[PDB]
C-alpha cells in the first residue's frame, strides 16, 4: 500500500515506526497535513519546516507525486555538532 516509515525523533513522538495508509495524497505535502491533523503530538512531530521527506530511497520535495505502492519515510533534519 503506502508504507509510511518514521525515523529518529519523529518516530519517537508518534510512537510507531511504520504505518500503512490508504492511497489519497497527490503531493507529499498532502499526506503531511492529514497525519499532522491527528493530534497536537502529531501536529508537532510532523510540523512543517521541521521535517524531511524521503520517497523510495531518494530525497524529494514536499511535492513529489505519490501513487500506491510508494514508501515514504519521515525523519527530521540535523544541524549542530
Amino acid at each position: 500500500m503506502i508504507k509510511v516509515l518514521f525515523f529518529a525523533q519523529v518516530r519517537e513522538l508518534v510512537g510507531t515506526d511504520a504505518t500503512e495508509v490508504a492511497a489519497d495524497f497527490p503531493t507529499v505535502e498532502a499526506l503531511r497535513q492529514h497525519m499532522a491533523a491527528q493530534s497536537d503530538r502529531w501536529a508537532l512531530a510532523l510540523e512543517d519546516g521541521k521535517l524531511l521527506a524521503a520517497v523510495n530511497q531518494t530525497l524529494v520535495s514536499f511535492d513529489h507525486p505519490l501513487t500506491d505502492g510508494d514508501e515514504v519515510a519521515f525523519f527530521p533534519p540535523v544541524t549542530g555538532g
Binding site: F7, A8, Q9, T58, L59, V60, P76, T79, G80, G81
Partner: protein, 217 residues
C-alpha cells in the same frame, strides 16, 4: 612528501594497507585541510585527522571553551575553560602529533574571507551548527571547486554527506559522526576507496540503524 624514518614507523599500520602504501601516507602529509567548527564534531574529527597524519590543519572557530562542552569535547579541559577553542584544540592536537603543522584562526570570517581561505586548501570540514555558515561554505567550496565533507548531529541523530561538485546530545554520537567525517576526508585526500558523495548516510542512535538516501539536483 618524503617521510622520515620516524614518520615511517609511526604511520606503519596505515602504510601497509593494500592500496594505500607509502604513496597514501605522502599524500596525507602534503594535504592542507580546513576544519570549520572546533566544537563537538570539529573535536572528534580533528583528533584522527591529526594522528593519521594530515600535514597541515587550520582550525576556524570564534567561540570559547566552557563547562557544558566538557561532556563531549574531549580535546578541551577544565584548565582551558574560557580560553578560545582554536587554541585549546591546537594545544591538545599538537600533543597527539608533533609532526603536523597546525594553524588556529580565532574569528568569524565573512563571505569574502571564507572564499579566500577555502581556495587555499584541498578539502574543507563542515563542523558547524547553523545553516548560515553551512551555506557560505557550500557556496565557497562550489565556487572554488573544493571538496566538502559535511556532517551534523543533535539529540540521538547524525548525518554525513560528501560534495565533490536547547536540544540535548549524547556524548558518543558526536564521535560516531565525527570519526566518519575524518575517514571520508582521508579517502578523498589519497584517492583511497569510493567517497560518499551523492547521498546522505543517516545514523539513528536510539535504535542503532543506518540509512542511505539518494540525493537529487
Amino acid at each position: 612528501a618524503e617521510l622520515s624514518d620516524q614518520e615511517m614507523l609511526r604511520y606503519n599500520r596505515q602504510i601497509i594497507l593494500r592500496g594505500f602504501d607509502f604513496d597514501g601516507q605522502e599524500a596525507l602529509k602534503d594535504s592542507r585541510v580546513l576544519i570549520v567548527g572546533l566544537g563537538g564534531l570539529g573535536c572528534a574529527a580533528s583528533q584522527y585527522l591529526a594522528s593519521a597524519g594530515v600535514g597541515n590543519l587550520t582550525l576556524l572557530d570564534f567561540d570559547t571553551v566552557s563547562l557544558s562542552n566538557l561532556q563531549r569535547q574531549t580535546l578541551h579541559s577544565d584548565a582551558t575553560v574560557g580560553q578560545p577553542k582554536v587554541e585549546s584544540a591546537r594545544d591538545a592536537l599538537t600533543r597527539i602529533n608533533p609532526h603536523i603543522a597546525i594553524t588556529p584562526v580565532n574569528a568569524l570570517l565573512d563571505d569574502a574571507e571564507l572564499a579566500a581561505l577555502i581556495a587555499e586548501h584541498d578539502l574543507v570540514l563542515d563542523c558547524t551548527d547553523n545553516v548560515a555558515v553551512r551555506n557560505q561554505l557550500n557556496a565557497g567550496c562550489f565556487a572554488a571547486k573544493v571538496p566538502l565533507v559535511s556532517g551534523a548531529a543533535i539529540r540521538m541523530e547524525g548525518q554525513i554527506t560528501v560534495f565533490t561538485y536547547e536540544a540535548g546530545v549524547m556524548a558518543p554520537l558526536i564521535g560516531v559522526i565525527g570519526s566518519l567525517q575524518a575517514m571520508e576526508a582521508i579517502k578523498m585526500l589519497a584517492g583511497y576507496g569510493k567517497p560518499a558523495s551523492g547521498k546522505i548516510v543517516m545514523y539513528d542512535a536510539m535504535t542503532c540503524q543506518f540509512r542511505e538516501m539518494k540525493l537529487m539536483r
